[PDB]
Amino acid sequence: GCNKALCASDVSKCLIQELCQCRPGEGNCSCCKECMLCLGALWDECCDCVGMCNPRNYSDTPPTSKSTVEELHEPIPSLFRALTEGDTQLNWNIVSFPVAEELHMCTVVYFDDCMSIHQCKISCESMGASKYRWFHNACCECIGPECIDYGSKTVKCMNCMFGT
Amino acid sequence: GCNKALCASDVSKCLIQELCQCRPGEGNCSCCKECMLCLGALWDECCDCVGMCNPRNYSDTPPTSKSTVEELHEPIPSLFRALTEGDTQLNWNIVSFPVAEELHMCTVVYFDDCMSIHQCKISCESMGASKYRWFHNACCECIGPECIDYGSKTVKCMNCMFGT
Ligand SMILES: [Pt+2]
Ligand SMILES: [Pt+2]
Ligand SMILES: [Pt+2]
Ligand SMILES: [Pt+2]
Ligand SMILES: [Pt+2]
Ligand SMILES: [Pt+2]
Ligand SMILES: [Pt+2]
Ligand SMILES: [Pt+2]
């Protein structure tokens, strides 16, 4: 967790000054701003040692955790509904879930085969979608006009489950 | 707009069949699914010609339009409040706006100097922020525990206005 070699000098200096005596983890941390100021430039790499921030990660972050979301110019809701309601394309998996679950109803389209972001944007634009979310596993999720937000964080598209 | 050389053959073939006779732009487009099926693989690059999708872009998309958003593991709201309420760091610009404006109140932090995404994530994590949004102009916006969503789409951080 703590990087002792980098941080021991300055961290001790703050401790001697008696800063960073307050734990954020339970209750208010009155001293947190003062502790950050005393650490200065080393706060990012040494806040773990004083307990003010989480230890340097013990875990490997899944690629799916990142996603990049953009809102398409000039959405065409009628096209999106027309291509969604009817017998959906096999390459397309269609999910409708109640709107604001991710935080009437929100409908999204999950492309099957994994695709590049630029392709994902083009395909959503051709679909009339209001917005698209591109998972960094490369799964593509067009977002419908109804949806308030960017839709489900889940990588629900078949034939690209990588990251699970 | 329309790519005549690529699309003229197939597009004419659909037109002769009398598909793509319905405009999505005003009113329902009954034929939209049939038109897409007739186009098949060329729908993405030729839907403009039949009017079912917007013409290939006349405009250069600003870099700021893309952003990538991730939610930090183990957020520490007390730290975020402690470092936000008090005399804010000069490198940090602090904006509080009513929650759900982007779609009680949502508070976000806009880093001044433009930074890489990995740095932006580390700095937000040290800040206790629930989530971070990284603009592709490279402006970094940590997102507070209060905020329902990912916060303002605006690139409001000083000393990285590139893309405006
Ligand atoms: Pt700091
Ligand atoms: Pt429902
Ligand atoms: Pt399947
Ligand atoms: Pt799966
Ligand atoms: Pt299609
Ligand atoms: Pt307010
Ligand atoms: Pt400024
Ligand atoms: Pt500006």
Author numbering:
A (entry chain A), B (entry chain A): 25 to 127, 165 to 225
Provide text from the study.
We crystallized and determined the TWSG1 structure at 2.6 Å resolution using a platinum single-wavelength anomalous diffraction experiment. TWSG1 crystallized as a dimer in the asymmetric unit, an arrangement that we observed in two crystal forms. The structure of TWSG1 reveals a modular architecture, comprising an α-helical N-terminal domain (NTD, Cys26–Arg80) connected by an extended 18 Å-long linker to a mixed-α/β C-terminal domain (CTD, Pro87–Phe223). The NTD of TWSG1 folds into a compact bundle of three α-helices locked by 7 disulfides. The CTD of TWSG1 is stabilized by 5 disulfide bonds (VIII–XII) and contains a sheet comprised of 5 antiparallel β-strands which constitute its core.
Twisted gastrulation (TWSG1) is an evolutionarily conserved secreted glycoprotein which controls signaling by Bone Morphogenetic Proteins (BMPs). TWSG1 binds BMPs and their antagonist Chordin to control BMP signaling during embryonic development, kidney regeneration and cancer. TWSG1 is composed of two distinct, disulfide-rich domains. The TWSG1 N-terminal domain occupies the BMP type 1 receptor binding site on BMPs, whereas the C-terminal domain binds to a Chordin family member.
